[PDB]
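Example 169.
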Amino acid sequence: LTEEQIAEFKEAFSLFDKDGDGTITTKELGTVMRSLGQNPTEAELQDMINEVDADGNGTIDFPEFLTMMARKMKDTDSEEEIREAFRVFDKDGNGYISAAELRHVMTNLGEKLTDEEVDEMIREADIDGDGQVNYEEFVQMM
Amino acid sequence: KSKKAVWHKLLSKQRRRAVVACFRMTP
Ligand SMILES: [Ca+2]
Ligand SMILES: [Ca+2]
Ligand SMILES: [Ca+2]
Ligand SMILES: [Ca+2]
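Predicted structure in complex with calcium ion:
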């Protein structure tokens, strides 16, 4: 993996590391999962950590996180996080994100919305003015 | 009053969702 790739995964790791101490605990994993609408049990959190806890000290450090992330990338069907994310938004895969597609992602992620907010979000990202957000515009905005 | 913050929050929430799935897909 390149240094830029390592940096991206550091960003991801930091979205979980609540205390910023360099490790992801079962409790931290659970907080993120709870925020996403999931309520895993303690043993469940323990197995998720265990499967990736290479040295077995009970928490996940960045090297272990990287091994996991690297394993995912080093696979034919795995794309870059940014591209994978764009595809979550662009469900019909035509390369453009519609208002309906944006409302769907926001709803799925528990983000409240109004039509005006959605229209301004698109407008702000819509550089070529075609009424939708293409990949290039998606990258620029994100 | 820019909308960039909402866009950025969605990306971050999705990135977290994908990492959780990765903890599950691992094998
Ligand atoms: Ca931590
Ligand atoms: Ca460990
Ligand atoms: Ca689309
Ligand atoms: Ca556009």
